[PDB]
RNA sequence: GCUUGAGUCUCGUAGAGGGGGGUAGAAUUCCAGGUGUAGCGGUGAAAUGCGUAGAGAUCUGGAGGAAUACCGGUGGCGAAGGCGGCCCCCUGGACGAAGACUGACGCUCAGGUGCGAAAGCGUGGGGAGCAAACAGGAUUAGAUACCCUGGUAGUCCACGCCGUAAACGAUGUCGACUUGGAGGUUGUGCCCUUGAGGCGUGGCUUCCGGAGCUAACGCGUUAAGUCGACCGCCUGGGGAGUA
């Protein structure tokens, strides 16, 4: 569920300020940190068709945010996907 | 770290066996940096219905804080012990020192 | 519904107290209910139908409160 | 897992293989091997006593430890190996003093796990301890029949034995056949359940696949002549007889158990 | 024989019959009498009066044992649920206590299908 | 009626049986909230606590054991 | 550029939301016994069925599978299908208060992809109760039905397939505006909680009705009222959702 102490690392690391949550880089970095943490739950509980709907919403919402960032600027988008590791 | 409310009932004929095992199970909590907050001992009680005959038992209450894994090898020693009956391990938090 | 007969008592007092204990426990209703299988779609329909009556019949006597009959 | 061979040939259409990547791929352990010559069913007199046996691949016997009478000395599982003499895979085991052994592999044993034997052992898969110390209602395997004999029951792939109840000096077990049988309480029993549970689902797919396990063809009694088999006879598929074994005894229904010496232990027959 | 002093009356009331069995406190049956065996075959054994006669006959057939106290343990629905207990007092016994035992599952087995 | 458990707001604990014995019938059945008057929130905590004291044999499932 | 849409972070609340593993009590059936006698069961009435080889009843011991009385509520959660014992592990959504942050990142969506009751299919287990097919007894003019006595697949589990229901508030999703009343459930703010209190504010939901709309029945701030964006579908009945 991305506990409080872990979500404070991503916000500080990917944020442009100490309390700068909500920036497109931070939001995508938070969503990736949960999609990766849920790949171990669904390798065992393959039949969680109800929790997978929540997972497929963070996947489809991180792609909606990456599209916005790329269209707004590309100097910041290419750094973020490289830093995180995605888009294959 | 997680908080629990272990309550287990011993055989009525092991009333002299509980006061030794109560610290042995406690020692496993404190060995792994887990604390214990309220350790009331209800003594010998009467069951509302028989449990494999045995109209009496011996209740203990631990209410410890321990890592999630330490309670896992404490549940099994309750399971394989022939003198511990009806162990129940809830997941409470905070409060202590009530009901007796 | 266990009833224990006390001291210095009649019998017909006790037997009447046995019925009252049994009626309060709904023993005969439960036995009659569990005799045959009630389909889940008829158990849910029989519950909403009997609650619709409970609502209307309470509002029916309210509309009949503000009338003179003769 | 079971994989279905693609129909590149009539004889590969219907094959289903059971492949276990966890198994050893090299050679077996040399010191624990023997010589295993075949017979073809033939006893002293050279006359076949079990029919439909002969041929097949050559095999070497692996000395599997059944007694499990090495108490203490925790042992680490080195590797899993394929045993041709059996239906379950075996496991090589190295004890803390340096002795290696072969054991029947339970269903949840991987390389690196730790087992041990004796009355002090823990209730875990792979551990052997006398059924006095094993909780009632548990699922064991490699059960014994006499204290110290070695282990006879629940030995094939995926088989197990439930301990239904314990009555004093005896233990009642629900054997895999449905029987309820009393055994002594000092008989050891490896705790767990034997591995290779997919052994059922394999299908050979062709006649050679059974020939190269040493299974010679079975001839029906109807195709026989009236002198070779009680069924025999016939001019165009005639039977008119109550089915019998080739020696006159009525198959298909007739019970043949007669011991009267081990009847004290059979609480309830099969069903 | 054996001169039992305290007994238990087991009334197996049902929608179609009524079986009265008088046992000692340890469960052993001393004698019994039903409603349909009392000359009430057909639609007359359901009636609560036919169950009263069963309590009378079951009060007999235990004359030899000489019971003086009875605990009544009613079971099931049916007309012979009330008229049997009072006939065990009009027969001269003493009702120490009355306990209703009845199989009520906590939603266990599936009951038969509805009649049409 | 509605009074108890709403003043002195507290979470129904399964350990104290004196409070629990008030909210059961003569046969161990939980009493409906229409009769006692407990609020719909605290009845859920109350019922869940009675089902927990029964497991530990502090309370009877039925009066005929 | 901006923050009034949308989203992120901090603190809590409620819940049969999901997947996995254990455990408790009541009850049905079966097995081994003790007591005990001639009936039991069923029906509108009967018979088939069980029982003197001793049933039904009652007590003791044991083994098994399925479902969770009371709480329980036009109550709650979920996108829909649906979800009801208790405990632990993993996990999704919603809501509320005060703030901070990003700064149109939004709505709908042909093809496409996923989930989708019950029955049904395949492989392997399980099998108490119930029960298509089946057999017998009745009813009947007949009764390959309703009723009764039994009873296999199935119902249960693991993994695959099927992809349909009166899958229904017969009402597509999103946003704005337009008199009221009595309730349910779940947060929160202020004051005499000073006493089972009083006043506001949000989320979800059941009922009755106003203008309006409607062929009428009826819907009626959760519209079937007044408007905007996108999609799906209709064009007389039968043949036919058939070739
Ligand atoms: Mg053959
Ligand atoms: Mg020939
Ligand atoms: Mg011959
Ligand atoms: Mg011919
Ligand atoms: Mg012929
Ligand atoms: Mg019937
Ligand atoms: Mg959409
Ligand atoms: Mg489409
Ligand atoms: Mg199905
Ligand atoms: Mg099937
Ligand atoms: Mg099958
Ligand atoms: Mg359709
Ligand atoms: Mg529906
Ligand atoms: Mg439609
Ligand atoms: Mg209206
Ligand atoms: Mg078609």
Automatic annotation (TrEMBL), chain E:
Signal peptide: none
Keywords: Ribonucleoprotein, Ribosomal protein, RNA-binding, rRNA-binding
Highest taxon above the source species: Bacteria
Gene3D superfamilies for this protein: Ribosomal protein S11 (3.30.420.80)
Pfam families reported for this sequence: Ribosomal_S11
Subunit comment: Part of the 30S ribosomal subunit. Interacts with proteins S7 and S18. Binds to IF-3.
Matching PANTHER family: 40S RIBOSOMAL PROTEIN S14/30S RIBOSOMAL PROTEIN S11
Function of the molecule: Located on the platform of the 30S subunit, it bridges several disparate RNA helices of the 16S rRNA. Forms part of the Shine-Dalgarno cleft in the 70S ribosome.
Protein name listed in UniProt: Small ribosomal subunit protein uS11
Organism of this sequence: Escherichia coli
Automatic annotation (TrEMBL), chain F:
GO BP field: translation
Protein origin, superkingdom: Bacteria
Any Gene Ontology CC annotation: cytosolic small ribosomal subunit
Gene Ontology MF: a single term: small ribosomal subunit rRNA binding
UniProt entry keywords in alphabetical sequence: Ribonucleoprotein, Ribosomal protein, RNA-binding, rRNA-binding
Stored Pfam families: Ribosomal_S18
Subunit architecture: Part of the 30S ribosomal subunit. Forms a tight heterodimer with protein bS6.
UniProt record similarity statement: Belongs to the bacterial ribosomal protein bS18 family.
Function: Binds as a heterodimer with protein bS6 to the central domain of the 16S rRNA, where it helps stabilize the platform of the 30S subunit.
Descriptive protein name: Small ribosomal subunit protein bS18
């Amino acid at each position: 569920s991305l506990s409080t102490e872990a979500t404070a690392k991503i916000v500080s690391e990917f944020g442009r300020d100490a309390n700068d949550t909500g920036s497109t880089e931070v939001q995508v970095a938070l969503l990736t940190a949960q999609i990766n943490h849920l790949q171990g739950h669904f390798a065992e509980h393959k039949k969680d068709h109800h929790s997978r709907r929540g997972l497929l919403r963070m996947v489809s919402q991180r792609r909606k945010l990456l599209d916005y960032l790329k269209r707004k600027d590309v100097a910041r988008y290419t750094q973020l996907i490289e830093r995180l590791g995605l888009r294959r | 770290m997680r908080h629990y409310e272990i309550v287990f009932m011993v055989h009525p004929d092991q009333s002299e066996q509980v006061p030794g095992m109560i610290e042995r199970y406690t020692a496993a909590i404190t060995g792994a940096e887990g604390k214990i907050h309220r350790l009331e001992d209800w003594g010998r009680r009467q069951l509302a219905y028989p449990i494999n005959k045995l109209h009496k038992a011996h209740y203990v209450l631990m209410n410890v804080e321990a890592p999630q894994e330490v309670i896992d090898e404490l549940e099994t020693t309750f399971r394989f012990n022939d003198a511990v009956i009806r162990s129940m391990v809830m997941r409470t938090k905070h409060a202590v020192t009530e009901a007796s | 519904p266990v009833i224990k007969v006390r001291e210095n008592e009649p019998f017909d007092v006790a037997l009447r107290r046995f019925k009252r204990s049994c009626e309060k426990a709904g023993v005969l209703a439960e036995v009659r209910r569990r005799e045959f299988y009630e389909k889940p779609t008829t158990e849910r329909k029989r519950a909403k139908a009997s609650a619709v009556k409970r609502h209307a019949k309470k509002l029916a006597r309210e509309n009949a409160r503000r009338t003179r009959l003769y | 897992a079971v994989v279905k061979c693609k129909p590149t040939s009539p004889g590969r259409r219907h094959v289903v293989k059971v492949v276990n990547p966890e198994l050893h791929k090299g050679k077996p352990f040399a010191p624990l091997l023997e010589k295993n010559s075949k017979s073809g069913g033939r006893n002293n007199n050279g006359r076949i006593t079990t029919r439909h046996i002969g041929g097949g691949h050559k095999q070497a016997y692996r000395i599997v430890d059944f007694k499990r009478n090495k108490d203490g000395i925790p042992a680490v599982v080195e590797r899993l190996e394929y045993d041709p003499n059996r239906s379950a895979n075996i496991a090589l085991v190295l004890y803390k003093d340096g002795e290696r052994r072969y054991i029947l592999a339970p269903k949840g044993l991987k390389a690196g796990d730790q087992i041990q034997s004796g009355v002090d052992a823990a209730i875990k898969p792979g551990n052997t301890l006398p059924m006095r110390n094993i909780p009632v209602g548990s699922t064991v395997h490699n059960v014994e029949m006499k204290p110290g004999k070695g282990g006879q029951l629940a030995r094939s792939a995926g088989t197990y034995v439930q301990i239904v109840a314990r009555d004093g000096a005896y233990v009642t077990l629900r054997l895999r056949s449905g029987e309820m049988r009393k055994v002594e309480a000092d008989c050891r029993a490896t705790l767990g359940e034997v591995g290779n549970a997919e052994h059922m689902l394999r299908v050979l797919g062709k006649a050679g696949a059974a020939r190269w396990r040493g299974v010679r063809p079975t001839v029906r009694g109807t195709a026989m002549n009236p002198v070779d088999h009680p069924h025999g006879g016939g001019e165009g598929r005639n039977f008119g007889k109550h089915p019998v074994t080739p020696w006159g005894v009525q198959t298909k229904g007739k019970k043949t158990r007669s011991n009267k010496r081990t009847d004290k232990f059979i609480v309830r027959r099969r069903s | 024989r054996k001169q039992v002093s305290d007994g238990v009356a087991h009334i197996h009331a049902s929608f179609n019959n009524t079986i009265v069995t008088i046992t000692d406190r340890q469960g052993n049956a001393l004698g019994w009498a039903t409603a349909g065996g009392s000359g009430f075959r057909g639609s007359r054994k359901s009636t609560p009066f036919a169950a009263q006669v069963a309590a009378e006959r079951c009060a007999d057939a235990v004359k030899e044992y000489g019971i003086k106290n009875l605990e009544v343990m009613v079971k099931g629905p049916g007309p012979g649920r009330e008229s049997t207990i009072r006939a065990l007092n009009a027969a001269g016994f003493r009702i120490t206590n009355i306990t209703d035992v009845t199989p009520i599952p906590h939603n266990g087995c599936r009951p038969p299908k509805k009649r049409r | 009626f509605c009074r108890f458990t709403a003043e002195g707001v507290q979470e129904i604990d399964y350990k104290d049986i004196a409070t629990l014995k008030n909210y059961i019938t003569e046969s161990g059945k939980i009493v409906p909230s229409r009769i006692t008057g407990t609020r719909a929130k605290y009845q859920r905590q109350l019922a869940r606590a009675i089902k927990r004291a029964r497991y530990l044999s502090l309370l009877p499932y039925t009066d005929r054991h």
